[PDB]
Structure 1
Amino acid sequence: HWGYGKHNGPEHWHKDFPIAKGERQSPVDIDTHTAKYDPSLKPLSVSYDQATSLRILNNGHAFNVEFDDSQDKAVLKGGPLDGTYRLIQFHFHWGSLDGQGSEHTVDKKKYAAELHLVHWNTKYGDFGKAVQQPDGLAVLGIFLKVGSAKPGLQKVVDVLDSIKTKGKSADFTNFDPRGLLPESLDYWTYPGSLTTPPLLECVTWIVLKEPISVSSEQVLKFRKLNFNGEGEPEELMVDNWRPAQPLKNRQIKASFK
């Protein structure tokens, strides 16, 4: 089944998921000179004060930090969105080396990793129904560069030992995702897809212009996770990113001048 290796990586996905070659796939390169300022965009509203994290899981492709999404507790609205989208999970994509790992690129620049905060449109009732809709998800994408540590990341890095291999989970309550955000909420936005199978075309992407800094030792800990399950040969969880896909008939809009 699908993964990030030579025989089951991104170039193979289209055989099980033909939407891989669709009209609104992600990630894409963000050409900053070509992205037009849209003064009708709103400021993004990120309301995470009531966020209830539950659990962290190694799903064999990434780790997910999951939230209670059974009430409007941690929501994204405004920016390019109509309506209210509820946080369900976040995860990252990262490299084996600091020079690669992000999925979106900015004038072809790759960051060391990229955080995805995944939210579903509450007009659709749940995540499953939302992913059948072209406006079912909003993902806030935040780039990571290696420099100073991000203190708000450390509780995630510290628990990774406990979910080393595929299928492991751990209790992960009272984590506050506000500690993962940069200062500015200036962003680029375009219609896209999940960047992992099933690659569904449901996503309003909102990609923050300002990266966060994480330390070398923090990203080193991501790279000790494993794609395999316990008892199988060790294959380090690195380079779980999809390269940029054709922009096709899409315009990337900037919320800022």
Structure 2
Amino acid sequence: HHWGYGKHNGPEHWHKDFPIAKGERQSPVDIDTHTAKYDPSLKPLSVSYDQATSLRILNNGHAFNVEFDDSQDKAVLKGGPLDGTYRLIQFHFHWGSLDGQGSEHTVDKKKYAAELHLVHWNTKYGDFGKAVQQPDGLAVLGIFLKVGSAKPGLQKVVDVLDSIKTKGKSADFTNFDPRGLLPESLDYWTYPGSLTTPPLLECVTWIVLKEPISVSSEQVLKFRKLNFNGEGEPEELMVDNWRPAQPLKNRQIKASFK
């Protein structure tokens, strides 16, 4: 009865309504560093978020999304393994109920406390709706979060969570700079995959950053006080909204560094 991350409608049940869940290029996957192939022909990533227009933040019952104005080429991603220009449309997180779990992708079986997804769509296709119908329609920039010192750029996001506590609530969120959530280095692994939540469409080129960002115990704690439920329903904490690693099948993970 509409997907979730619970015992009764969680990841292992998604295949009943979304048959593609057992396909050939499903995400997330485990990054085995010793089998990733160094590819010297990969180009440096090109992140241009200087004219980024954030609009609002909302709780959709699965996670919280900060949306951006993508009517024009304001914030894009170019280079790396990409072909063409991809527009930033929204970013969201996946997190756990404990510091030792949260991320969707793992590195050599190791799980991080959470994972950030910056979602972009191929401008060649006109609009997001069309992009989700093509093999190279999306580009998701994934960043891992580990518990340590505080991250300044994340605090503004943390402060407003109280106003979007339950399903369906939103709040205006203008003038937010995404550049405050990037690690120093832009080295990455890349592979062809899918969305990690229903519809689970196989239209994504995944770009996972090697270097994770640090956030405090207090910062992640705040994420854990959100609700899956809308106002007036019984309370169900929003935690562990992540999908388990899927088999790689016949794909190869390419690294941009040695």
Report how far residue 19 of structure 1 moved. Answer: 0.5
Q: Residues of 2 paired with 1:93 and 1:204: CA distance?
A: 18
Please give the secondary structure, in 1, of the residue aligned with 2:139: strand
- 1:155-186 residue CA offsets vs partner (Å, 9 max, x unmatched): 00011100000110000000000000000000
What's the secondary structure of 1:12's corresponding residue?
Answer: helix
The TM-score normalised by the length of structure 1 is: 1.00
How far does residue 244 in structure 1 lie from its aligned partner after superposition? 0.3
Describe the SS at the equivalent of 1:64. strand
Tell me by how many angstroms 1:128 deviates.
Answer: 0.7
Equivalent-residue separation in structure 1 for 2:136 and 2:188 (angstroms) = 18
CA distance in 1, matches of 2:215, 2:117: 15
Shift of residue 15 of structure 1?
0.4
Stretches of structure 2 that go unaligned for 5 or more consecutive residues are: none
* Offset, 1:188: 0.3
Question: Between Structure 1 and Structure 2, how many residues are aligned?
Answer: 257
Equivalents in 1 of 2:111, 2:3: separation in Å? 23
State the distance in 2 between where 1:160 and 1:133 align.
34
Supply the distance in 2 between the matched residues of 1:155 and 1:196 (Cα, whole angstroms): 26
- Percent sequence identity is 100
CA shift digits 1:101-160 (9 cap, x unpaired): 000000000000000000000000111100011100000000000000110000000111
- 2:167 & 2:251 partners in 1: Cα distance? 36
For 2:63 and 2:128, locate their aligned partners in 1 and report how far apart those are by CA, in whole Å. 19
CA–CA distance in structure 2, aligned partners of residues 188 and 119 of structure 1: 17
- The match for 2:221 is 220
Separation (CA, whole Å) in 1 of partners of 2:136 and 2:234: 40
**Displacement, 1:40?**
0.6
Instruction: Quote the offset at 1:32 in angstroms.
Output: 0.4
In 2, the alpha carbon distance for the partners of 1:190 and 1:256 equals 14
Which stretches of structure 1, 4 residues or more, deviate above 2 A after TM superposition?
A: none
- Deviation per CA, 1:58-93, whole angstroms, max 9, x where unpaired? 000000000000000000010000000000000000
The TM-score with structure 2 as length reference comes to 0.99
What SS does the corresponding residue of 1:123 show, helix, strand or coil? helix
Distance in 2 between residues matched to 1:33 and 1:130, nearest whole Å: 33
CA shift for structure 1 position 7: 0.3
In structure 2, distance between residues paired with 1:105 and 1:93: 13
CA RMSD of aligned residues (A): 0.4
- Secondary structure of residue in 2 paired with 1:5: coil
Tell me the distance in 2 between the aligned counterparts of 1:37 and 1:176.
32
Distance between the aligned counterparts of 2:140 and 2:120, measured in 1? 6
* Shift of residue 233, structure 1, vs aligned partner: 0.6
Q: How far is the alpha carbon of 1:226 from its aligned partner?
A: 0.4
Q: Cα distance, 1:191 vs. partner? A: 0.3
Q: Gaps (5+ residues) in structure 1?
A: none
| SS, match of residue 256 in structure 1 | coil
Question: What is the CA–CA distance in structure 1 between the aligned matches of 2:201 and 2:160, rounded to whole Å?
Answer: 30
**1:153 aligned partner:** 154
Q: 1:55 Cα shift? A: 0.4
Distance 1:17 1:159 in 2: 34
Q: CA deviation at 1:12?
A: 0.3
The CA deviation at 1:198 is 0.4
C-alpha distance in structure 1 between counterparts of 2:40 and 2:71, whole Å: 34
